[PDB]
Amino acid sequence: LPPLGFAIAQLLGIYILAQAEDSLLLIDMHAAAERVNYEKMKRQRQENGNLQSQHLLIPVTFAASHEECAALADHAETLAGFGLELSDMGGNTLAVRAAPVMLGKSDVVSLARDVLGELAQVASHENRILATMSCHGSIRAGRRLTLPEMNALLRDMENTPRSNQCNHGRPTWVKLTLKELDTLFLR
Amino acid sequence: LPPLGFAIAQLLGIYILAQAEDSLLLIDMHAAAERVNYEKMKRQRQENGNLQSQHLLIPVTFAASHEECAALADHAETLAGFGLELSDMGGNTLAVRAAPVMLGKSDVVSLARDVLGELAQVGASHENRILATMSCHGSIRAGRRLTLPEMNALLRDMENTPRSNQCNHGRPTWVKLTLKELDTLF
Amino acid sequence: LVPRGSHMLILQAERDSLLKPLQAFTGIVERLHTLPILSNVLIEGRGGQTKLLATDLEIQIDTAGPEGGAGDFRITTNAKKFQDILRALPAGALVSLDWDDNRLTLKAGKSRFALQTLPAADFPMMNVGEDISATFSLGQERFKTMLSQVQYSMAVQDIRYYLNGLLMQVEGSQLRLVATDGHRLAYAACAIDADLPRAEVILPRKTVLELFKLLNNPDDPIQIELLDKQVRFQCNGTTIVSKVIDGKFPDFNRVIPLDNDKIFVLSRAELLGALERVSILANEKFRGARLFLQPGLLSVVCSNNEQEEAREEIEIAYQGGELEVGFNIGYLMDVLRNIHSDDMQLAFGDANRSTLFTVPNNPNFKYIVMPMRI
Amino acid sequence: HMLILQAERDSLLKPLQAFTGIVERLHTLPILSNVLIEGRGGQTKLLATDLEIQIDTAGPEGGAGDFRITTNAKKFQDILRALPAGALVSLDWDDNRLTLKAGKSRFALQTLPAADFPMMNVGEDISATFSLGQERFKTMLSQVQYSMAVQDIRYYLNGLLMQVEGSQLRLVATDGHRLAYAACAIDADLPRAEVILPRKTVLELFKLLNNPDDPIQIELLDKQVRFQCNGTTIVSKVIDGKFPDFNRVIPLDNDKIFVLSRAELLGALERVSILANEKFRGARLFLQPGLLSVVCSNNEQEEAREEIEIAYQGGELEVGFNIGYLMDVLRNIHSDDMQLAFGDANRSTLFTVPNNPNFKYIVMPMR
Amino acid sequence: TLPAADFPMMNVGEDISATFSLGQERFKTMLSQVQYSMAVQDIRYYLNGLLMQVEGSQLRLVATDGHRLAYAACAIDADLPRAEVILPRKTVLELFKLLNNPDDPIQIELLDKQVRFQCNGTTIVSKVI
């Protein structure tokens, strides 16, 4: 009954699910589990004022080229409004002490560094701030898909999807029909 | 042994997909298994002069058209040579007590009917009924191939068995896609 | 001299006297490794006494096996098959181990087993450092209690590798176990019967779990020796040698808050049950739980995607100011699950900084969680 | 980029080849796969170890001023052997990289610090020191090696007992089913001492004894043994245990004694072994006055038989043997005649060299 | 022993499409020049072998595994029509063993889907691929 539902192999880096009424499909990768998993970040940006965040205990210091405080000290309200909270511990050293939970796993240094240089502007409304945060704070290249969530991940990605999320211009789920498989058997 | 591929899953009913160093490969399970079954049956026929047999629980309720019973009355030694031993129940019905191994798994009535209707007009003398006519089981038609620790066994079809590339007609039975399927994503 | 390929007795023992020492050497055996002999257990006989040994190149565990003489020997055999065979034998069955070339023969009842062996010279042995920086000992009950009080705050496979093990530190006559993931931290301490200079190691998580299994005699002590970047634990006739995590552990002193003013003591079991109840209708992935603290009342509230809400209240002996603070309910539940005391003391500052969990009249345990903004 | 070494190809490869034996190609410790090169005072030393046997030798000469490096033994030896006959090889040191330059070939190899190389804790308490010609030592080792056990459960049998008493040196080897005993006179007067040389040390020492004229010096440390010859030093641990009493094994009353041609018996065994059950082979010997018959049969009921004429009169005896235990002594002993002493099918069999008391070989027959 | 009645002789072909002969040393040199390019247990059964092709007075040996190819050729004392067979790898190795007389000639006959090699009083009949 439900369109676009299956779970097949996810060979090494491109997930595959084939039960959509005699037409096999293939999920892109975490490249899909990050584009679709972070459009709900835009949908959660409206439910409450700011992105739900966890404090840390031990703050994390990093390099922060040119101290990147031209984008942190002045732009502290919006930066805290999208989850990250940083303090300036010493000269040319930045210490993050709170990070959004939708990243979850780890490595707040990468998120902080590649979001600090993104908000260097001044319109004032930059949606791209979300996009960068999506590209690494998801299922990372590593352990294979969880079979308990193999089909569930595809169903959830499609449920909150936006019909070819097109983060890279490439359609995530590529249709390929039974007749197309029969045709591609070059005789 | 880096093989043809390493079977990863099923594909909607007729294909079995296997990952290898190149990409995932779509093996037409029925076609490739028909090829390998024909090959193995002929290899087991040129040697020992008969096919491997197997008995089984639950005979089949053949229903045995009239003259096929008389064909069974004709020397059933050849039928034992095809791996099919079957018995008469009465009137004009039969039931197979033993089916050849390498096919099994259903519809043994079709195999026995093919060979037994071939037993009419004794001349034999052709022996090319062991093809798709007797290979009218292949692998599973469209249902199930277990949970994968038998899929690789069919993925070992063409190792040490010839007649791989060109099928019974010329239609391919495996790979079309390479690692460069990213073009499909445009 | 005996005829070639004659079955030579090497061991005989009652079933349990063999299976019990074996069961100390399977939590470290990796059932499918790149080295076949790493899947084996080593049995050594000398002067009538037996030792069983296993390793994963990181943790080497040995113990005394059953008795039986007959020609000082060393064998290796597949740990899983051998243990399965022993476990499938009757409760008090007598087991006889023979050797014939590359085959080992178990005889028990009317049962033969022909297992295979690998050369003992091929078994990798850990090179134990001969430099000991500190040696001490303490009761196994206290050490196991401390381990259970801290081992739930470690981070499993974090990019900061030093936050995966447990910091074991000795200073003067004090032993301290500190565990911390990223957000939470647990600290346990006790007194030891020595005067040792300050030293510290970072025990790997697998070492922590195996050490937790090892502590089975509450009244007997365990001895800990800090080698040069190795640790040797010894107790119950069993020796564990373990590699350590090489790195600097974070300073937990700056971690611990010192000015939390809103303090109240409440039942551990009641609070844990309330948190378990309210977590049912919370979001299943991130689990935001809000605590409302008012004089005489503590409320726990949770909500999920489907606009469902759960709320419980607890009467407490509190009179200070109100405070609304968010938490990841897993951190709250872990301490209540792993602590076996009746009451717990909760100290809050403001909703932006650390919250202190303590056990009343127990200065040796501390637990710090920092809140989320939910 | 400091140039640390330069030498002709053979002057480096030849010292290296004294170390490929004891390097284990895949080992738990990474640096144990590396050879240690140590240059001091213009002299070069090459060293390797497996923590059981450490071998060191003098390498080439040259500048070689105060360096210590470790580099992968197999790759370095393979690169050296792949170079022309008289190539000039130069080793440069750049931090963590070793550059090998030869002709028009550059190799960038990874190195490991010498501070991490496990030098053996060589003992300094020498009990007995002696020396003997390398050829005699090699002959005795060849006479006794084949009776050693390989990867046996009783680890003390996975080696060779070397025993010095008075002016006599004895090598004993056994596997619980056969025993080889060799003895010789050495120009020394030592208190009775004995060690259990490991099998790997036995084989490496077999490789070492290449100069038939020069002597080899053997020193007994406290549970270690040092061999020195040809500018090469081998320090080996000894097996911890007490070796079996070989006197209880050697029979002294086997009366069915006869002498026969070693080559003829070896050929007879090689011919008859072709037809036998493979796992349990045993060939049967039938000893009757004037005749020795070697018979084999297999599962398929095929039978092979050879007969050898011998000078013998005392009774008859049928006895089964594993042909390996026979062919080993027939192949490694270089006398034309062999003297066989038999008891019965239960007792052992004594193989000796006629008029040579210094060699004995005992085999337990089967049923 | 086993009876000679059971031992199966091969059904030797009776239609000789082509017959030629050449120096054994030259054939061995060509085979050694092309044998290393054969595939070893490739799934393409037709590549685990050696294509022998005769056209006019030209004898040609072709081998390939998909990634490489070897071609050898020679002039033979014949005017045969174009024909080609795929000798199996085992046949190639046994024939490589067979060619032990550099001066004597070897005769090759292409039967119907079979090839017969004759030289030094030895005959080998093999099925083509």
Swiss-Prot record, chain A:
One of its GO terms (molecular function) is mismatched DNA binding. GO terms for biological process: mismatch repair. One of its GO terms (cellular component) is mismatch repair complex. Keywords: DNA damage, DNA repair. This protein is involved in the repair of mismatches in DNA. It is required for dam-dependent methyl-directed DNA mismatch repair. May act as a 'molecular matchmaker', a protein that promotes the formation of a stable complex between two or more DNA-binding proteins in an ATP-dependent manner without itself being part of a final effector complex. Belongs to the DNA mismatch repair MutL/HexB family. This is DNA mismatch repair protein MutL. It comes from Neisseria gonorrhoeae (strain ATCC 700825 / FA 1090).
